[PDB]
Amino acid sequence: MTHDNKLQVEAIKRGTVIDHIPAQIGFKLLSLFKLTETDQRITIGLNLPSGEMGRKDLIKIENTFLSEDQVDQLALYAPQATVNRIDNYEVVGKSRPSLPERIDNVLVCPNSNCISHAEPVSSSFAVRKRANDIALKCKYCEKEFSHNVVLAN
């Protein structure tokens, strides 16, 4: 839905194309979800010319498809991203990030006494909405935190 035509573009024969990523979320994603830990062709456009954002983020992964969960996983960060599957130079189906149920491996617990901190474990959080923020309850300390807080730099 982004059309740059003075320095044209290419839409891969097959694989997934993640659209409308907000800017500076773009790196955050692939660093968070190791999408670059693959040898398949990847095309990344940073701070692109978007109609709605002006500066948007756009990942293109080749010969590669992501579970809905994968896609749902991205809701926290790019809640407006657009996963497009693609086969034979065509749009085999749009997709949308839906707030998961749980969030494993990427999150980090605010509780400095949680055992997930000193041991080799996968952070897991149950996801509940609260008409103001999403709440995340830690698998281990069972403490609940504002997503705003869990995502704290």
């Binding site: 509780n111 006494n113 949680c114 055992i115 997930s116 901190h117 000193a118 041991e119 080799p120 474990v121 830690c138 698998k139 281990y140 300390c141 069972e142 403490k143 609940e144």
Partner: protein, 310 residues
């Protein structure tokens, strides 16, 4: 099998009202008809990475009363592992190759829950994981409320003191929230008030409760009076003194309390219950402590025993 066979008891929230009733029932039975060779040949690990020789002794006592053998430790700054080198995973992993179940107390929250991921099949019981959970204490508690009240439903339950930093009160309330018609009284000092989330689950589940400043205010209606310690350390030793006089129970304070009214306390008390209360019938903290033995016997039996044959 029984619903709890071979399951890990980690948090009080993971348990159902049926699961609760089942344990409470069993407890009454082992309290009633003792099965002293029931867990014979079984060897249980009593790992207290955190010292607490009230909980420990209870558990272990339980263990022997069912005929199990006991190995373990207390404070692992004496132990050889876990000060800088051994992870808890690697420790559970080794331990769970030669005991039949693990009871563990640990300074960090979520320590019992992590254990489960490395114990394989060996069941893990939480005897305290930092400020998180202490299920057995609550079990002990309910089983005493039940055995003295006759129910877990339609009670008038007052929790008093440090309601802010009292894991056992938050659990009790949650647990008690599993049953219906219960009415709550929260008599706490503002810096140490019942946390919001708890208050919301009540409002949410439709359970009635109200804040109060005076015990006296609400004595005549309470069946259960659950007391907590007001760890002065939790505040200004001068700002403590100022409030403390409002949340201390003297014998005299009980003169209008129901026949069935029972005063409860997780222990150790210190200043909040005057010793003249001991001398009264309402005093049930020691009894409540001893009931810890069946609560734990109950648990041990069900997790380790496929068929509870009573």
């Amino acid at each position: 099998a029984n619903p709890l066979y071979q399951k890990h008891i980690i948090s009080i929230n993971d348990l159902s009202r049926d699961d609760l009733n089942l344990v409470l029932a069993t407890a009454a039975k082992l309290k009633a008809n003792p099965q002293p060779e029931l867990l014979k040949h079984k060897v249980i690990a009593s790992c207290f990475f955190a010292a607490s020789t009230r909980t420990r002794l209870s558990f272990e006592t339980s263990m022997h009363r069912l005929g199990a053998s006991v190995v373990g430790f207390s404070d692992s700054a004496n132990t050889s592992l876990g000060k800088k080198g051994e992870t808890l995973a690697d420790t559970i992993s080794v331990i769970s190759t030669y005991v039949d179940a693990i009871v563990m107390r640990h300074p960090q929250e979520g320590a019992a829950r992590l254990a489960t991921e490395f114990s394989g099949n060996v069941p893990v019981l939480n005897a305290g994981d930092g400020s998180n959970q202490h299920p057995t204490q609550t079990l002990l508690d309910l089983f005493t409320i039940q055995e003295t009240q006759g129910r877990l439903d339609n009670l008038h339950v007052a929790m008093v003191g440090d309601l802010k930093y009292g894991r056992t009160v938050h659990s009790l309330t949650q647990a008690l929230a599993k049953f219906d018609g219960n009415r709550f009284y929260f008599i706490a000092p503002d810096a140490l008030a019942m946390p919001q989330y708890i208050l919301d689950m009540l409002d949410e589940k439709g359970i009635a409760w109200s804040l109060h400043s005076s015990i006296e205010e609400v004595m005549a209606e309470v069946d259960i009076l659950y007391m907590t310690r007001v760890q002065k350390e939790r505040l200004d030793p001068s700002e403590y003194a100022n409030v403390k006089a409002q949340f201390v129970l003297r014998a005299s304070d009980l003169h209008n309390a129901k026949a069935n009214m029972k005063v409860l306390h997780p222990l150790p008390r210190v200043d909040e219950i005057a010793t003249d209360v001991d001398k009264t019938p309402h005093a049930w903290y020691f009894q409540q402590a001893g009931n810890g033995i069946f609560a734990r016997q109950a648990l041990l039996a069900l997790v380790l025993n496929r068929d509870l044959v009573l």
